[PDB]
Design a protein around this ligand. Structure first.
Ligand SMILES: CNC(=O)[C@@H](Cc1ccc(Cl)cc1)N(C)C(=O)C[C@H]1CCCN1C(=O)c1cncc2ccccc12
Ligand SMILES: CNC(=O)[C@@H](Cc1ccc(Cl)cc1)N(C)C(=O)C[C@H]1CCCN1C(=O)c1cncc2ccccc12
Lengths: 303, 303
């Protein structure tokens, strides 16, 4: 029993984290085989972070300008390349701790574990979701750039996020490991701001199924709704549309609890219209949207 | 910016986890130097879990009855000992991945990271608090026994919890690594139940300081209170008494925000008497009590 924000064990990623220093700037890099991946903004001075030309800044650098440290061990840079918003530093040593890995780009509404790192040293691990507006509600301070987000499938680390920057509302923006930003954000100081966000409806429904599996049933009702009528309510409360594909993804949790998806939709409609009336679900007084159907199945009992 | 339930990186503990099998029962063990620590209830059949005599059950066992596996590698048991509610299995191989470690017992209100394990394989990491009633609101299924709780200070793993059992309300009970239960619980099937619980007042105040550091200020007021008058309100709402020692522990967060502790106590009194009026603090619609002052300083900006 119980239900927590549960990260993947971080060991396989801790062994890949390094310190990257260029001039006065230090941040984190990801060391896989003989390549160190880090945010390209490591090559910026400070005054030129308003409108940098990164192609001009990189051509002015040589391998010796980059200091890479795996704990105490110095990794000599033998090549440098820009790929979109990431730097690829070829090093003389293949990481002996390189896990089986993939670079995957995630969808808004998908979750991942973040290993927050400072000076190439892991400090903590937490769960995050990619918001519909392509921001993440992370926990990051000065020096956290190059911290990575990941999922683990069997022995294989699927890297999905590298941390680049903070937006004015205190939410975070970054790239996939191919250096392509999530969302309409750029790696320079502008007036850029998080767009309007919505609540991830399929995740709220997954979390109500987690609650039922864990014995919170007070929000259940005899009523059902149509998908169309539910989506009218979703639109009114700034919730994402629910698709038939979402209804199918909730099939296993529906089967396990014996609560039809459209019956659970009727419960969510009542929670949106009425609130909780001072009650809680899985120790929350609000409708939680950062657990996927996968996260619920991963963590919850099979009975 | 931001504020998450942040666990310690789990790598140092992942390398210590093993599978322990005795007859038909499999659970997890902790492999440090040449000793594997696990719950003594691994030696129970099933019928005799109502009123086991563990001294009688253990004297009937030999080293060959215990199968210990570190992944694929078989660890031959060369000795067995009972220490309170834990079994100490001496093995022929010292764990080459043994971190610097201590066995520490924690206080109610203290937090720790849990590495949830099944069949000696880590599945996930999350933050927990020791409740005032000496239960933990964990997330554990069949086979999770021997999962451990820990804190990390520099390079040193402070092990504080081993998982033994679930109580009827779905909360969890276990021991320190010397095998001494937290709270009035026993490792056998009885009618035992979690005692009445209270809210950890010093942690709620730490979390309000985290909110102010992160720019949630709506709950602040010009008012102050006395420690005595606050503690009358605390008693009414089933909150733990606040001591002068707690006020001193909140000194650094008070200094950083410029909000006197007794001013923050006046804010908490108003939140208890009025509620939030449909507003949120650090993305919660309730008063969070599983962040210590240490957790807030560990995670939050120093400015
Ligand atoms: C409100 N912040 C901003 O608007 C933007 C502006 C900007 C955008 C893109 C670039 Cl490339 C540079 C500047 N700023 C200042 C950052 O993102 C700081 C980032 C990028 C440069 C290092 N850096 C960080 O170490 C950093 C990362 N995570 C959270 C933080 C919280 C506190 C302090 C620093 C951080
Ligand atoms: C409601 N549960 C109970 O009352 C008690 C009774 C009891 C107390 C002490 C002992 Cl030594 C044995 C039985 N039970 C059945 C457990 O704690 C199960 C524990 C102890 C024996 C294995 N075990 C688990 O693998 C287990 C652990 N964590 C959460 C679980 C959730 C689901 C299933 C199993 C677990």
């Amino acid at each position: 029993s119980g239900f927590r924000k549960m990260a993947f064990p971080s060991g396989k990623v801790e062994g890949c984290m390094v310190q990257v220093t260029c001039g006065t700037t230090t941040l984190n890099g990801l060391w896989l085989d003989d390549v160190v991946y880090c945010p390209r903004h490591v090559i910026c001075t400070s005054e030129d972070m308003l409108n940098p030309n990164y192609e001009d800044l990189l051509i002015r650098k040589s391998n010796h300008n980059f200091l890479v440290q795996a704990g105490n061990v110095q990794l000599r840079v033998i090549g440098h390349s820009m790929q979109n918003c990431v730097l690829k530093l070829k090093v003389d040593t293949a990481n002996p701790k390189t896990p089986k890995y993939k670079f995957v780009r995630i969808q808004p509404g998908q979750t991942f574990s973040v290993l927050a790192c400072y000076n190439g040293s892991p400090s903590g691990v937490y769960q995050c979701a990619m918001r519909p507006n392509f921001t993440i509600k992370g926990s990051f301070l000065n020096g956290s750039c190059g911290s990575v987000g990941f999922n683990i499938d069997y022995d294989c680390v699927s890297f999905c996020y590298m941390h680049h920057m903070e937006l004015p509302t205190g939410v975070h923006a970054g790239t996939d490991l191919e250096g392509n930003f999530y969302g309409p954000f750029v790696d320079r100081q502008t007036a850029q701001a998080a767009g309007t966000d919505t609540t991830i409806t399929v995740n709220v429904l997954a979390w109500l199924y987690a609650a039922v599996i864990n014995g919170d049933r007070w929000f259940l009702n005899r009523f059902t709704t149509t998908l169309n009528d539910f989506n009218l309510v979703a639109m009114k409360y700034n919730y994402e549309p629910l698709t038939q594909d979402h209804v199918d993804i909730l099939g296993p949790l529906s089967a396990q609890t014996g609560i039809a998806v459209l019956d659970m939709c009727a419960s969510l409609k009542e929670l949106l219209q009425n609130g909780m009336n001072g009650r809680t679900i899985l120790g929350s007084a609000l409708l939680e949207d950062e657990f996927t159907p996968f996260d619920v199945v991963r963590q919850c009992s099979g009975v």
